[PDB]
C-alpha cells in the first residue's frame, strides 16, 4: 500500500512544541526581568560555567543552511533527544513554573507535555521515516543529564527556552518538506 497523510500528526506535534516553547519563553522573560538585570546577563553569558547548558552535548545545527541539509530522520532524532534531555531536569523548575503567572506553568503539566510530544515524534520517525540512513553518530547517542539558586534556575530557564526553540524549529523544517501546502503560498 502507499502511505497515510501525516498532516494530522504534524499539526498535533507542531501545536504541542509551539506550546512548550511559548511556556518556556514566557517564564524565562518573567524570571529574567525580576531577578536578572543586564548586569547579570552578560556576566552569566560571558561565563560558560553558567551560560553553558547540559543539552549542548547532542550536536544540533546552527543556521538555516546547515539545518536545511539535515535528513528528516536526523532532524527528528535530535528533537527526540532534546525532549528527552529535559525530561528529568524540568523536575526542578517546578516551583518557578507553579510560582509564575502563566496560565499553564507547572512542573507536572510540563512533564506530561514532554512525555506527550516525545511519543508523537517517535511515531513520526516510524512513519515519516524519509529514506535517511538510520546509521550515524547522533543516531547512536542517548540524551543528556543534569547536575546558588537564582542563577541555577535562570540558567535552566535560559536553556529550556533555547532548546524548545530548537525542537520547534527542527520539526517545522520536516513539516514543510513532508506535508505539502502546509507552509503554503
Amino acid at each position: 500500500f502507499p502511505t497515510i497523510p501525516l498532516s494530522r500528526l504534524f499539526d498535533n506535534a507542531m501545536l504541542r512544541a509551539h506550546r512548550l516553547h511559548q511556556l518556556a519563553f514566557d517564564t524565562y522573560q518573567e524570571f529574567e526581568e525580576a531577578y536578572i538585570p543586564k548586569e547579570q546577563k552578560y556576566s552569566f553569558l560571558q561565563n560558560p560555567q553558567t551560560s553553558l547548558c547540559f543539552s549542548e552535548s547532542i550536536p544540533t545545527p546552527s543556521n538555516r543552511e546547515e539545518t536545511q541539509q539535515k535528513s528528516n530522520l536526523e532532524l527528528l532524532r535530535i528533537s527526540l533527544l532534546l525532549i528527552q534531555s529535559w525530561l528529568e531536569p524540568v523536575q526542578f523548575l517546578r516551583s518557578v513554573f507553579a510560582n509564575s503567572l502563566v496560565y499553564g506553568a507547572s512542573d507536572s503539566n510540563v512533564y506530561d507535555l514532554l512525555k506527550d510530544l516525545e511519543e508523537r515524534i517517535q511515531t513520526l520517525m516510524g512513519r515519516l521515516e524519509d529514506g535517511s540512513p538510520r546509521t550515524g553518530q547522533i543516531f547512536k547517542q542517548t540524551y543528556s543529564k543534569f547536575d546558588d539558586a537564582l542563577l541555577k534556575n535562570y540558567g535552566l530557564l535560559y536553556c529550556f527556552r533555547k532548546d524548545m526553540d530548537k525542537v520547534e524549529t527542527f520539526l517545522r523544517i520536516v513539516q514543510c518538506r513532508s506535508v505539502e501546502g502546509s507552509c503554503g503560498f
Partner: protein, 196 residues
C-alpha cells in the same frame, strides 16, 4: 559617548548593530566550549550604513552567544551581549491590497478583505521562520488605532467599515515566540464605493 541603539535580525540569517555618532566595534561569539574570543573587529562598516556593522550569514549563527563592544581611544563606550535568535525583528509585510467582501446594500457599512505578502527575506516556505502579523486601521482624521488580534495568515476581513469615510490600514510582522514586531508596512488607504 556613543552608545548602542539597536541590533536586529530581519530573517534569522544575518544581523546588524547600529549606534549614535573613530568608533569601531569588536565582536566575539562562543565557538563551542569556552570563547575563542580573539575579539575581531567589525567585518563590514558599510553594507548597513553609518554607525553600523553588518554580519552576514557567515558571521551569523543561532543559539550561540555573542558579545560586542564599541571601543574608542582609551575607550569602551558600550558593551553588549546577546544571542541572534532572541534578536529577530522581521521586515514589514508588503504589497497590501483590499476588495469588497460583501456589498452592504443601503450603504453606510461595508466589509472588505485586506491582503499582503510576507517580506521577501523570511524563509517561511521551508520552515526557518513562522510569522504572526498584526493589522491596525483607523479613519484618516482620528489618531487612535483600532487594533486587531494577530492572525496567522496573509489575509483577513475587516468588517463594518462606514462607507462615508476614508480609512487607513497597516500591518507588521513578528516571528512566533519572540518579542519583536518590525516596523509597520506602508499605510493602505481605503476608499469605498458608497451611495449604491
Amino acid at each position: 559617548e556613543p552608545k548602542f541603539t539597536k541590533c536586529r535580525s530581519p530573517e534569522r540569517e544575518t544581523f546588524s548593530c547600529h549606534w549614535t555618532d573613530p568608533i569601531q566595534l569588536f565582536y566575539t561569539r562562543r565557538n563551542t566550549q569556552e570563547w575563542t574570543q580573539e575579539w575581531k573587529e567589525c567585518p563590514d562598516y558599510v553594507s548597513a550604513g553609518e554607525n553600523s556593522c553588518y554580519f552576514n550569514s557567515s558571521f551569523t549563527s543561532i543559539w550561540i552567544p555573542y558579545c560586542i563592544k564599541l571601543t574608542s581611544n582609551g575607550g569602551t563606550v558600550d558593551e553588549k551581549c546577546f544571542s541572534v535568535d532572541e534578536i529577530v525583528q522581521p521586515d514589514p509585510p508588503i504589497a497590501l491590497n483590499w476588495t469588497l467582501l460583501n456589498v452592504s446594500l443601503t450603504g453606510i457599512h461595508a466589509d472588505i478583505q485586506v491582503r499582503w505578502e510576507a517580506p521577501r527575506n523570511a524563509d517561511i516556505q521551508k520552515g526557518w521562520m513562522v510569522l504572526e502579523y498584526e493589522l491596525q486601521y483607523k479613519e484618516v482624521n482620528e489618531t487612535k488605532w483600532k487594533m486587531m488580534d494577530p492572525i496567522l495568515t496573509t489575509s483577513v476581513p475587516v468588517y463594518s467599515l462606514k462607507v462615508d469615510k476614508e480609512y487607513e490600514v497597516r500591518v507588521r510582522s513578528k516571528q512566533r515566540n519572540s518579542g519583536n514586531y518590525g516596523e509597520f508596512s506602508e499605510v493602505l488607504y481605503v476608499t469605498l464605493p458608497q451611495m449604491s
